[model samples]
Target: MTPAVTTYKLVINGKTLKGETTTKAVDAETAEKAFKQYANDNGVDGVWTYDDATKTFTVTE
Candidate 1:
């Protein structure tokens, strides 16, 4: 079976970037949690938030 995937947007230094989580998550909140863990593992430090209207994540340092 294919693992569930989610999209998240990052806004850092006034630039926006898009990334997908390798971790499986069917829910946006859960996906954000997964992204947080992934970020920690990857040494990415920022404030994580989800936008329901835009369906994206905005990261602030």
Candidate 2:
């Protein structure tokens, strides 16, 4: 049997972002990519900052 894949949805500045991968990512690299795509498609101005110590992504407008 195949293991269940995990997906996470991120909302930043009232924007909905989606991301999916076979395995979970410990850092924001994956999320950054998703957010960048979303921003580009939506024509929004923002930036993705990753905190290595926290291993999380912070979306700023």
Candidate 3:
């Protein structure tokens, strides 16, 4: 059987931008890394937080 997958979404703000992105991960920790990597690749740096209640990662400058 396949493990249940979680949908992780990213909300970026704190600059002159406001947008979103998404990826899928099997767990919370992976989700954290995924978003951080995503932001880093795009040249964004700041605080990253995962919202268990909404399954969303909020990034702020």
Candidate 4:
């Protein structure tokens, strides 16, 4: 059986924020698109900054 993929919530100010897809693609571009869409939909006034070294998204406030 295939193992369940883990998902995380994009929280802001200690509140659970809603995001669309949790499964990120291997490519950075694809992941950025997903994150951007979620941020836009949720009214998050910030840009998705991807770190090449850390490979993480830092949602600014």
Report, for all candidates in order, the number of backbone clashes.
Answer: 0, 0, 0, 0
Better of 1 and 3 by lDDT: 3
lDDT of 3 by residue, 1-61 (tens): 9989999889999575569988898998898888888788777888878779999989988
Output the lDDT of residue 39, model 3: 80
Best-matching candidate per lDDT = 3
Clashing pairs in 3: none
Residue pairs clashing in model 4 are: none
C-alpha displacement of 25 in model 4, angstroms?
0.2
Candidate 3 global CA lDDT score: 0.85
**Where does candidate 4 have its weakest 10-residue lDDT segment?**
6-15
List where candidate 1 sits over 4 angstroms from the true fold: 1-24
**lDDT of model 4, residue 3:** 44
* lDDT comparing candidate 1 with the true structure: 0.59
lDDT of 2 by residue, 1-61 (tens): 8554334344455245443222244335665677567667766566656555544455545
- Name the lDDT of candidate 4: 0.55
RMSD (Cα, Å) of candidate 1?
4.8
lDDT of 1 at 32: 74
Ranking by lDDT: 3, 1, 4, 2
Best by TM-score: 3
Error of 2 at 1 (Å): 11
Q: Model 3 — which ten-residue stretch has the worst lDDT?
A: 14-23
Query: Cα miss at 58, model 1 (Å)?
Result: 1.6
lDDT of 2: 0.51
For model 1, how does the per-residue alpha-carbon lDDT over 1-61 read when each residue is reduced to its tens digit?
Answer: 9766655554433224344434445667786776676666666777767776766666655
TM per candidate: 0.53, 0.41, 0.86, 0.56
